[PDB]
Design a protein around this ligand. Structure first.
Ligand SMILES: [Cl-]
Lengths: 87, 32
């Protein structure tokens, strides 16, 4: 079962939350909610009106969802541990 | 789960996410 692992805030964007499963849940300050996970090619985007829409690997997305993904890639920098690995 | 094996795999799963979205953004540049 996927537990919440780390929660991060981004001014003036929103909050992102990493889950155990490898998922990332962003809750934007415009009422939008992007959900993304490693291994899974699909992306679920919920809009301010409340509609949730799943999008597959080869589905043309509108700029409003591409912009939030660009942004999600930049939020992914805030959960990265830069400490070097040894042993 | 183990402390080393959990924390390494979570940062490994995060790296794969960044790359997946990076392919996706490029894939979109080719579409439709
Ligand atoms: Cl969140």
């Amino acid at each position: 079962s996927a537990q919440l692992l780390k929660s991060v805030f981004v001014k003036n964007v929103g909050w992102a939350t990493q889950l155990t499963s490898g998922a990332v849940w962003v809750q934007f300050n415009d009422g939008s909610q992007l959900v993304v996970q490693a291994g899974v090619s699909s992306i679920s985007y919920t809009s301010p009106n409340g509609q949730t829409t799943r999008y597959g690997e080869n589905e043309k997305l509108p700029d409003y969802i591409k912009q939030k993904l660009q942004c999600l890639s930049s939020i992914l920098l805030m959960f990265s541990n830069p400490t070097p690995n040894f042993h | 789960p183990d402390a080393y094996r959990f924390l390494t795999e979570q940062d490994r799963q995060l790296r794969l996410l960044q790359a997946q979205i990076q392919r996706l953004l490029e894939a979109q540049s080719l579409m439709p």
